Amino acid sequence: SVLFPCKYASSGCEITLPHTEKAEHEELCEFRPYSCPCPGASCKWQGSLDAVMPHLMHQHKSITTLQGEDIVFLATDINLPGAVDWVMMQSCFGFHFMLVLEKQEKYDGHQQFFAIVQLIGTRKQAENFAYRLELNGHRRRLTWEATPRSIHEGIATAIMNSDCLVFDTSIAQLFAENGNLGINVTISMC
Template structure:
């Protein structure tokens, strides 16, 4: 007679009890995890777990976007599936970037934070604007910039100067320079656009071509100089995973208007001095 092993889930846990998490190492564990797949986005439905009146589960991200259950077309009320939430507390779930190589499994409480910093997530092109739709892995960012955005070289120095030619042109434009120091690559961006009342604005920022966790190790200084004035901006670096336009909207970069740019420009050209520091 074959033996069958049952998984017994505790009905009540006191603070002193240590309930072990079940990693997806066996067929039965993988089956349990598969029960949490949302039928809409195919990610995992994690606490708070919502269901239709017939018991079909949805993740909390998809639920507000729907009127009827995608499985049975039944009405969607705000019904919590407390039993499955308790089961979710006992399981480890794979990272959503497992398809690109991440092998980590995590509790549902750790999953979102891990995925925000996961080194296997795809990156978008760091050049501002919606024109380039490229996405790829981190090691493909620099080849993409050189091949598609005409970034000719990487300057091997802690200090560089971004030379912006013809800042008086009427259209929006982006100037880029890449520099390498401390064993990492950085991209400095000077963007000319219109943010408020159709008035030209300049936005300058330095980003690490790396993860957000790696970016925390560095800071940068941007400096504009003339014979009688100096403008300085210091800030922690951000990862290229953060969109430059969003950072500009949040004023998390150096911003200056055309009058200020003209104060530091020479013959219509502007030199932006950039220094990278280790925190």
């Protein structure tokens, strides 16, 4: 009956729990310092939820932004050497959703593409939405529907487990035109 751990009370975590449920509570605690949602270990920034957007606008380059729950993101030069990440912020339902398209080079001889959507918010908040990604081509269509992850959790684990849209260089050429790739992104509430 002794409540004591939780290393986040300082950040406003007015909660006290037993030592048996410490390790688990912390990983998914609400008051755990959010990391920079941008792909890449380049930005070491850390801070609170409400500090995220400001961090992205002021201390990061100009990211493309689109209004609406149904839009089309154009990832240009998907073949360009050096290209590895495409980021776009989607504003709808009073929230901001980050779309990330990552191109990873694999040792076994191929280049994979990972597209996923992250909500600039909490896990319980993310659970209320659903996103759909579409690659539309001539008489062809590749679609991925799933629940957006919260930036708290990150995109890394999901990408590691292929829990997102996964395609590759060859699939990307099938849908691309003039070296550019259009990705339909649709977000909806449950």
